[PDB]
Amino acid sequence: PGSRQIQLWHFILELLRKEEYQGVIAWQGDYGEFVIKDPDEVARLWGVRKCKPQMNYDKLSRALRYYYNKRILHKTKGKRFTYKFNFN
Template sequence: MAWQCTMFGTFLLNLVLVFIDPMEWSIGNVQKWILWTEHQYRLPQSGRSFQDLTGRDLCSMSEDSFKDRSPLCGDVLYAHLDIWKSAAWMKEKTGQGDLKSCGGSGGVRESWTDSEVDSSSSGQPIHLWQFLKELLLKPHSYGRSIRWLNKEKGIFKIEDSAQVARLWGIRKNRPAMNYDKLSRSIRQYYKKGIIRKPDVSQRLVYQFVHPQ
């Protein structure tokens, strides 16, 4: 039964990967992506809440809009869409495919490039995964605390765990924040498929999960 589930998940992913760039997704691609994400990470079904939306529509939506449509897992779907957008941008930047970024008219551009806007400026509550990306995209300010090991694959290392925890505590107004608490929050992303340990596990090294 397990191999059948794996084959089903792979089949769905292959259908979605007609275009890895969400901006290119049709209404059908959006539904297939949601179905695959639900299957892969055991999320509640929410495809009906996103009917008649193209990939461009999804890219223009805020996290609150996702949660309004799907209160149980809208935040997870939003995070995964951000990862797919980042993957599309990196593929375009490295010449691995004729793909467009999730930018342009009506779109929201999210990428692992140094030009990304500070997440705090959007007025949205910031998540830890967003905060880590924000630090990584400012190496001149935070390179001694956290840095990319392989930017294309989303692999990064926390060099100064106490400092990263302190910065996160300041951002969230939690003076008692320490790395034990922060690392527990990072591990919660494993099941959601947002962050994982790389294939070769190393201390304080993590990877943003994104399509290959």
């Protein structure tokens, strides 16, 4: 059709614009910054969505680190599980 596979940063935003996932992941601090409150839950869902049952935060976080070079994401240093989108 024109369908690519579901990107992880698509999937993070999908969750982050839904109040029914605030317990798991939410916006915090500055503009574009977010926090994972339940790292193991996020990964489980990202495993469910990609039919990859052995997914976990170690593997998911690697995925996120590959976004640093690509200028989609980066880390907020000091704050745990706190990344921030590159909207500039």
